[PDB]
Design an enzyme around this catalytic site. Structure first.
Site, PDB file in Angstrom:
ATOM      1  N   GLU B  49       0.883  -1.180   0.000  1.00 23.71           N
ATOM      2  CA  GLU B  49       0.000   0.000   0.000  1.00 23.71           C
ATOM      3  C   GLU B  49       0.917   1.224   0.000  1.00 23.71           C
ATOM      4  OE1 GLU B  49      -3.283  -0.919  -0.283  1.00 23.71           O
ATOM      5  OE2 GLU B  49      -3.839   1.166  -0.658  1.00 23.71           O
ATOM      6  N   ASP B  60      -5.043  10.603   8.157  1.00 25.80           N
ATOM      7  CA  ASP B  60      -3.736  10.143   8.687  1.00 25.80           C
ATOM      8  C   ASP B  60      -3.410  10.830  10.007  1.00 25.80           C
ATOM      9  OD1 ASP B  60      -2.531   8.101   6.878  1.00 25.80           O
ATOM     10  OD2 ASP B  60      -2.926   9.688   5.381  1.00 25.80           O
ATOM     11  N   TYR B 175     -11.001  -3.265   2.828  1.00 31.85           N
ATOM     12  CA  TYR B 175     -10.183  -2.671   3.904  1.00 31.85           C
ATOM     13  C   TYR B 175     -11.002  -2.629   5.193  1.00 31.85           C
ATOM     14  CZ  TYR B 175      -6.472   0.192   5.910  1.00 31.85           C
ATOM     15  OH  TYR B 175      -5.436   0.681   6.642  1.00 31.85           O
TER      16      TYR B 175
HETATM   17  O1  LIG Z   1      -1.000   1.110  10.578  1.00 27.73           O
HETATM   18  P1  LIG Z   1      -1.719   2.467  10.553  1.00 27.73           P
HETATM   19  O2  LIG Z   1      -2.512   2.677  11.798  1.00 27.73           O
HETATM   20  O3  LIG Z   1      -0.810   3.623  10.176  1.00 27.73           O
HETATM   21  O4  LIG Z   1      -2.788   2.340   9.367  1.00 27.73           O
HETATM   22  C1  LIG Z   1      -2.323   2.082   8.041  1.00 27.73           C
HETATM   23  C2  LIG Z   1      -3.015   3.045   7.128  1.00 27.73           C
HETATM   24  N1  LIG Z   1      -2.517   2.982   5.752  1.00 27.73           N
HETATM   25  S1  LIG Z   1      -3.534   2.692   4.540  1.00 27.73           S
HETATM   26  O5  LIG Z   1      -2.909   3.116   3.325  1.00 27.73           O
HETATM   27  O6  LIG Z   1      -3.933   1.332   4.694  1.00 27.73           O
HETATM   28  C3  LIG Z   1      -4.950   3.708   4.797  1.00 27.73           C
HETATM   29  C4  LIG Z   1      -6.222   3.201   4.587  1.00 27.73           C
HETATM   30  C5  LIG Z   1      -7.327   3.991   4.831  1.00 27.73           C
HETATM   31  C6  LIG Z   1      -7.168   5.297   5.277  1.00 27.73           C
HETATM   32  O7  LIG Z   1      -8.265   6.165   5.528  1.00 27.73           O
HETATM   33  C7  LIG Z   1      -9.515   5.775   5.309  1.00 27.73           C
HETATM   34  F1  LIG Z   1      -9.882   4.755   6.073  1.00 27.73           F
HETATM   35  F2  LIG Z   1     -10.314   6.793   5.560  1.00 27.73           F
HETATM   36  F3  LIG Z   1      -9.730   5.454   4.055  1.00 27.73           F
HETATM   37  C8  LIG Z   1      -5.893   5.802   5.483  1.00 27.73           C
HETATM   38  C9  LIG Z   1      -4.789   5.008   5.248  1.00 27.73           C
END
Ligand SMILES: O=P(O)(O)OCCNS(=O)(=O)c1ccc(OC(F)(F)F)cc1
Ligand SMILES: O=P(O)(O)OCCNS(=O)(=O)c1ccc(OC(F)(F)F)cc1
Ligand SMILES: *Cc1c(COP(=O)(O)O)cnc(C)c1O
Ligand SMILES: *Cc1c(COP(=O)(O)O)cnc(C)c1O
Ligand code: NA
Ligand code: NA
Lengths: 393, 268, 393, 268
Positions: B49, B60, B175
């Site tokens: 990702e 984020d 997800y």
């Molecule tokens: O391990 P962490 O806590 O940093 O989480 C990993 C996040 N990386 S990601 O690209 O999957 C990801 C997936 C969804 C996100 O926002 C959303 F849910 F609103 F869509 C943001 C990042």
């Protein structure tokens, strides 16, 4: 699914992470219910009258218009409690928070007036208020930060991105995405995801309703035009709303031209930006060619929201409202003119609206026209900004 | 292409979970980011990702906020990110590559043109973090026209209507959000999600990857045990970058160590 | 000879040089005529409504009084244009100047609010305004000096005597004693020679008239007491006047106690000074044992007029009104309380009135009492004064 | 006593005007102020007008404002002024001595007690600058009970009613104002006052002394020519003090020169 249309033509929507959709749906449902609830309307009317000081005056400006065929009135939102129109909608949103059983408020602020408005509404209605503010804004708005803290609000400096208003907007939404069950996000303009553009308009529309009644009483007719500055769009949509169906009435929105549109140092996304998707909406934005969100620039920090409410982008697209810009120097001259000729110190934000009405008069002094400027706030806060420029001339 | 479908079939054959690291493209610079990504793959990442640096990453937490800022300090642009993506795919033909995007970067030069560029460089999926299923139609349509899987987030709050929507609309993987709030290793999710995982399988959803707050081997094993196809980890990976900025060689060693441990936790 | 009684019992009179008597007689005659003139009353009412924003709200303070038998309302003169009650009477005096055919205004100011009020009235009504200000006050009131200059007023620093308010009062009268045929002296409080105490009361009495109507509407009865701070006496006599003949209504005036009456560092001449003759009147004064006029001290520079209006000395002498004092620290606590519990930032002047009502409530919390505090101004101007004290704690 | 009546009878016998200097008692200090006053008398002053330093002299222009401030810088009090007055009278038995007072200093310890102290030290008149004829009753009554002449100002504006009041109420001399405004040599009066002087004589007023802006010999001669009994000069006298602060000896020489010239202008 929603109860209300989230779009104004192509503009608006609900561009938030999925986790925040229930918070927006809950807010929309509470708002729709509140607007049908006579008890809610009576409580809001009570706060606006007995706490905020509504109705506000409509002041005629004969000294400014002498020797022309312009008649100019100012709608005196500068006389509202807190010194700006922002107080109207924070009182309504605080009541919505209570209707939903929430005890906490989150707000964003740039130059600090929305932070102060949010803090005073929260103090009155017994809510715990936290305010996000870009660290750069915290540094240069010590008076407003001190006001928020005197009123019992927590002010949280934001150091991410550019450490300015858009970064505080982001931080408010990041907080809300974890806290929505107990906290209401009290968004500061007629922008962001649905239902905020709709709510903020309906909680500002008494500006235009009163103006219509007052101008009918004094003049026996509607204005030729109503003129308002546009930072994010709340004071302007509040003035415009009750006139939208009066097709004879011009609706003129004034964006900050900063150092001049051609310099790129401005805050006029509606006419000189590019449509994008940010802060929960599809709307004109200040952005790089690559799609990174930029700051708005204006002598008046209060006009530096780097997008615009989607209803303004819609009203422009259909030709119902016209949008213009006014530079720093034009706004400064209007500020000085109102001080000297009417004894009113206007906000530099509102000075942009006045400057455009002065241009309408001076360019065509034998044109018969009845104009209303929304005087969105007072300018005590701006006297050192103006002193520092005048002194350096 | 069929990269997610082939990965999950291969993992199913081995009764194995997926381990999927997140990093920001170009953090802390283009050259070191390419080395980081090759190290993640060599250490056993099943998919990637990859974030494109954006001015306003409102999904984020601070760790990935600071990753975006490091990439911007290095002058990283979306165009440079797509050049990186083409090189990554040229080195690694089968690994699924997912992007984490914000809507403005997809909409900026036209939604269809964005997904066409994804297809050209060999991206497999796009998750647009600030587009809920309600707003997703033009994004998912453009994705599928260009052989890109549109990825949707399933909150732990998800009602039945939303599960049906995500199951119908998403491809590649679902997800599965660990929790409310924003990305970050300092906050661990605590949703059993057995029912959400069960409801998604009932509605023939793309296989679920559990993500947000995944920082340790036991969370990878727990995700698989709960019936998820795998787990995604970002802030934990990005924190190893932030900790080791002064020693690029030790940064790669610690990333290799961490990914090898997290992937081991997925194996039968 | 005069048309009206220049005295309130033993207090008041016309103690000016002989050269100024025609100016006072002319002013009295113009005032008596103006009060019988429906056109003058209509013009004054128009300015108060459409320019200044009258009527002002009457705000209930349930958060402050919770758990007691006190009901507390604030009369919101803080919402008047200019942010204080001073605007009411400067608009009336500017109209009197015009009635007498005068084109120029002279005003004195201490902390600057009267200078700003005089400058804004003069700007609106097309009068040339000059303001005397003690050089010490000029130095420490740069924001108000800048406001006066933005509004087109001349600000003249006064270096004679103590270079503070009493010295500016003297300089205004010295100027008027040569310029009376073309200039009106727009005195800033309900004090000085007759007819000023009478005029300023009548041009402030809408405060109490509106309060009476508003409290009757909300509560169905008169207040038990109305409470106002006393610097020179204008906001307090404006609140009191319409209640004087309602013998059930307490009239409580609050002088600044400064560091404490016993320190001598206060501004409470009515209860802790000595009757003398100065600034055209016989009244209680801050003075040395030898009869040299002294300064008033208060945390709130706006309460530092070193005497008091003769009608207050009279109402005290007959027992119709009661006068108390509030220290700097009590005023500061009231300021903080109103900010935190009602989201209103009060002037430190007005904070003295609120502090005494808080004492009335807290000392006897089971006493049933309906109180009105005159909130004479807003306290944006005081946030750095308050910041500097809090920060040093 | 009869000091004004005897002076004006003697001056009338010599067809002479009075020349009357004003100074502030204790300006620039007690000792130098006593020397100044003796110099004024030796140079030919017919009477004196003497101010008691007051915090708020609202009938005085800057020259006498600054005299009051110098006396305060020297710690001069009303009690010290009365000690000076007793000494001046002990040296000079016949010269009329008039005080220029502000109301608060007369009222402060009781109006009657003030005029009794005046009588004890041998003062002849008091002019209370901020008490108009309308407010004058207790002051004039106390003055006359203690053999003190109450002095009133006749403005050039004076209507018939005011002339009759000043004529009835005043004793010693009538103070004929040259002009509106405050004391000062920089502003010269320009009222013929032939009619005011004529009306005062018709109403049997105390003899008129013309004062405010009298700074030159020709103004003394002009005052007498117009039918006034004399002229009063202050800011011109006080300006010589202010100019010569650094040289007390030259200060006395210049005062002597000026007073000798002004008195010469009064002689037949
Ligand atoms: O391990 P962490 O806590 O940093 O989480 C990993 C996040 N990386 S990601 O690209 O999957 C990801 C997936 C969804 C996100 O926002 C959303 F849910 F609103 F869509 C943001 C990042
Ligand atoms: O020569 P100038 O211009 O300084 O004038 C001399 C003044 N000295 S005085 O004591 O006669 C004197 C007389 C009257 C005054 O005020 C009043 F008229 F209101 F009563 C003030 C001073
Ligand atoms: C906040 C503010 C503005 C700009 O915001 P809008 O939402 O565009 O109204 C304008 N005027 C004043 C006085 C403000 O405080
Ligand atoms: C001027 C002022 C006062 C004091 O003057 P008063 O004449 O006693 O009313 C009090 N409050 C405020 C806000 C003022 O501006
Ligand atoms: Na904007
Ligand atoms: Na006082």
């Amino acid at each position: 699914t929603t109860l209300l249309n989230p779009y104004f033509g192509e503009f608006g929507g609900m561009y938030v992470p999925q986790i925040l959709m229930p918070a927006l749906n809950q807010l929309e449902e509470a708002f729709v219910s509140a607007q049908k609830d006579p008890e809610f309307q009576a409580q809001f009317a009570d706060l606006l009258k007995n706490y905020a000081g509504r109705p506000t005056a409509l002041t005629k400006c004969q000294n400014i218009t002498a020797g022309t065929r312009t008649t100019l009135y100012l709608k005196r939102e500068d006389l509202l409690h807190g010194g700006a129109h922002k107080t109207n909608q924070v009182l309504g949103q605080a009541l919505l928070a209570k209707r939903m059983g929430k005890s906490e408020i989150i707000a964003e602020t740039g130059a600090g007036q929305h932070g102060v408005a949010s803090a005073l509404a929260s103090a009155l209605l017994g809510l715990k208020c936290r305010i996000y503010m870009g660290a750069k804004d915290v540094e240069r708005q010590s008076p407003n930060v001190f006001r928020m803290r005197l009123m019992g609000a927590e002010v949280i400096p934001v150091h991410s991105g550019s450490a300015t208003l858009k970064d505080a907007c982001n931080e408010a939404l990041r907080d809300w995405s974890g806290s929505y069950e107990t906290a209401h996000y009290m968004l500061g303009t007629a922008a962001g995801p649905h239902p905020y553009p709709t709510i903020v308009r309906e909680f500002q529309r008494m500006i235009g309703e009163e103006t219509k009644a007052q101008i009918l009483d004094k003049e026996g007719r509607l204005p030729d035009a109503v003129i308002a500055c546009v930072g994010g769009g709340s004071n302007a949509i509040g003035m415009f709303a009750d006139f939208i169906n009066d097709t004879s009435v011009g609706l003129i929105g004034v964006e900050p031209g900063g150092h001049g549109i051609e310099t790129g140092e401005h805050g006029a996304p509606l006419k000189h930006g590019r449509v994008g998707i940010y802060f929960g909406m599809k709307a004109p934005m200040m952005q790089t060619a690559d799609g990174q969100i930029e700051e708005s620039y204006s002598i008046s920090a209060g006009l530096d929201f780097p997008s615009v409410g989607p209803q303004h982008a819609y009203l422009n697209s259909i030709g119902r409202a016209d949008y213009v810009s006014i530079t720093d120097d034009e706004a400064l001259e209007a500020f000085k003119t109102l001080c000297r000729h009417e004894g009113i110190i206007p906000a530099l934000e509102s000075s942009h609206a006045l400057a455009h009405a002065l241009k309408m008069m001076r360019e065509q002094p034998e044109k018969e026209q009845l104009l209303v400027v929304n005087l969105s706030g007072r300018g005590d806060k701006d006297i050192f900004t103006v002193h520092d420029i005048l002194k350096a001339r | 292409m069929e990269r997610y479908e082939n990965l999950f079939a291969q993992l199913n054959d081995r009764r194995e979970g997926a381990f999927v690291p997140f990093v920001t493209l170009g953090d802390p610079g283009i050259e070191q980011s390419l080395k980081i990504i090759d190290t993640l793959i060599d250490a056993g990442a099943d998919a990637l990702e990859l974030g494109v640096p954006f001015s306003d990453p409102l999904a984020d937490g601070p760790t990935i906020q600071n990753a975006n800022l490091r990439a911007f300090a290095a002058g990283v642009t979306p165009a440079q990110c797509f050049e990186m993506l083409a090189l990554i795919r040229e080195k690694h033909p089968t690994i699924p590559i997912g992007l984490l995007m914000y809507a403005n970067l997809v909409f900026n030069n036209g939604i269809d043109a964005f997904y066409a560029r994804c297809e050209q460089v060999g991206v497999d999926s796009v998750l647009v973090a600030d587009v809920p299923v309600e707003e997703s139609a033009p994004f998912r349509q453009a994705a599928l026209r260009h052989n890109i899987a549109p990825i949707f987030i399933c909150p732990p709050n998800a009602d039945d209507d939303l599960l049906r929507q995500v199951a119908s609309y998403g491809r590649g993987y679902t997800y599965l959000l660990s929790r409310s709030g924003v990305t970050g290793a300092e906050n661990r999710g605590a949703l059993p999600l057995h029912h959400l995982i069960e409801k998604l399988k009932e509605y023939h959803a793309a296989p679920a990857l559990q993500g947000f707050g995944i920082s340790s081997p036991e969370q990878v094993s727990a995700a698989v045990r709960a019936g998820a196809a795998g787990a995604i980890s970002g802030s934990a990976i990005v924190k190893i970058i932030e900790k080791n900025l002064a020693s690029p060689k030790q940064m790669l060693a610690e990333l290799r160590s961490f990914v090898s441990a997290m992937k081991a936790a997925s194996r039968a």
